[PDB]
C-alpha cells in the first residue's frame, strides 16, 4: 500500500490511453456502499466525461457517475440511470458523496456537503464483487474500449468507498477532513496501476 495523502493524480492532456486502474480486495457481493471523492476540471463547458467507472464482467456499467453536458450529474447502477440536474456550472474543485442501499433503493447525493433529494433505484438488485475500477476512462468493455470523447482531463483524489451507508454526520466529518476508516478502498492504503500520461503532484484543493 502507498499513502496518497495530500497528493493527487494529474491527467494533463485529453487522450484515450492515459488511465489509472484500481484494485479492490472485495470478496462478498455488495448490497450497499458509499462513494466519496474530490475532483476538479474545467471540461464542464464542453463534452461529457466519466468520474468513476465500476464494471463487472457481465455489465460495463455496474456503477458509473458521469457528468452529462448541460444536464448535470448522472448516476447509474445496474444499467439504470438517474440524473441530478445542475442549473449553472461554476469553476472550482468539488467534493461529492453518494450512497445507495439495496434494501430500500434509496440514493443519497451530497454535492459540496449540500444534500440532494433522495430518490429510488433498482430495489432488490445486487452488485458483484469481482470488478475493474478505472479512473480517467469510461469503459464500455471489461478492460478497454475507452472512447476519446469521454476521457477526463483534470484532477481527482480522496477517492474512497465503503460497503454500507454512512449517516449524515459521518458525511459531514468526511467533507471537513476528519479521521475515518474506509473498508473497500482506502486513499491512505491505496493500491493502483497507472497507464499513460498521468502524474502525481500535491493537491490544489484545500
Amino acid at each position: 500500500q502507498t499513502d496518497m495523502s495530500r497528493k493527487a493524480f494529474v491527467f494533463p492532456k485529453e487522450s484515450d490511453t492515459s488511465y489509472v486502474s484500481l484494485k479492490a480486495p472485495l470478496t462478498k457481493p455488495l448490497k450497499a456502499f458509499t462513494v466519496c471523492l474530490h475532483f476538479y476540471t474545467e471540461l464542464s463547458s464542453t463534452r461529457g466525461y466519466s468520474i468513476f467507472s465500476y464494471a463487472t464482467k457481465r455489465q460495463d456499467n455496474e456503477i458509473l457517475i458521469f457528468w452529462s453536458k448541460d444536464i448535470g450529474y448522472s448516476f447509474t447502477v445496474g444499467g439504470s440511470e438517474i440524473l441530478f440536474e445542475v442549473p449553472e456550472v461554476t469553476v472550482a474543485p468539488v467534493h461529492i458523496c453518494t450512497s445507495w442501499e439495496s434494501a430500500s433503493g434509496i440514493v443519497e447525493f451530497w454535492v459540496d456537503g449540500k444534500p440532494r433529494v433522495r430518490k429510488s433505484l433498482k430495489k432488490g438488485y445486487t452488485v458483484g464483487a469481482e470488478a475493474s475500477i478505472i479512473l480517467g476512462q469510461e469503459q464500455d468493455s471489461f478492460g478497454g474500449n475507452f472512447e476519446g470523447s469521454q476521457s477526463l482531463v483534470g484532477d481527482i483524489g480522496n477517492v474512497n468507498m465503503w460497503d454500507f451507508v454512512l449517516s449524515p454526520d459521518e458525511i459531514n466529518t468526511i467533507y471537513l477532513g476528519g479521521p475515518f476508516s474506509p473498508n473497500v478502498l482506502n486513499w491512505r492504503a491505496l493500491k493502483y496501476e497507472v497507464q499513460g500520461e498521468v502524474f502525481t503532484k500535491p493537491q490544489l484543493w484545500p
Binding site: 456499467n61 458509473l64 452529462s68 448522472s74 444499467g79 440511470e81 440524473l83 433498482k122
Partner: protein, 125 residues
Amino acid sequence: EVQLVESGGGLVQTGGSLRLSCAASGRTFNRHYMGWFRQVPGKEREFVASISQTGLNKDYVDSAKGRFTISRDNAENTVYLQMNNLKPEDTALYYCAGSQSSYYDKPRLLTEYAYWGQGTLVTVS
C-alpha cells in the same frame, strides 16, 4: 411535448443497411428518452430498442443486439437507428416514440410511452 418525425425508410435487398433517423420538435428533447418500435399489419406495435437521455445507457431486443445500433445527438436532438444484415421478416412499419420528460431507467412496455410519430416503412426483398 416534442413532435416526432422519421425518415430513412424504403426497400432494400437482404444483407443491406439502413440508417433510419428521427427528428424531434421541442426544447426538452434532452429530457426525454427515445425508443424505436415495430408494427405489422394484423398485429400491434412491438418494442425494438431505446436510448438514454444523457446517451450513455441503451437497451436492445434479443434479435436486434449485435445487428442494430442506437444513438442520439443531443445538440442536433436527433435519434439514429442503424440496422444491418436485414432479413425479409424485418419488413414493417417503424415508429420513433419517446416520453419521459423526467428521469428513470429504460423500460420495455408501451403504456409509459406517450408521444408517437407518423412512422416509416421498411422492406426487405
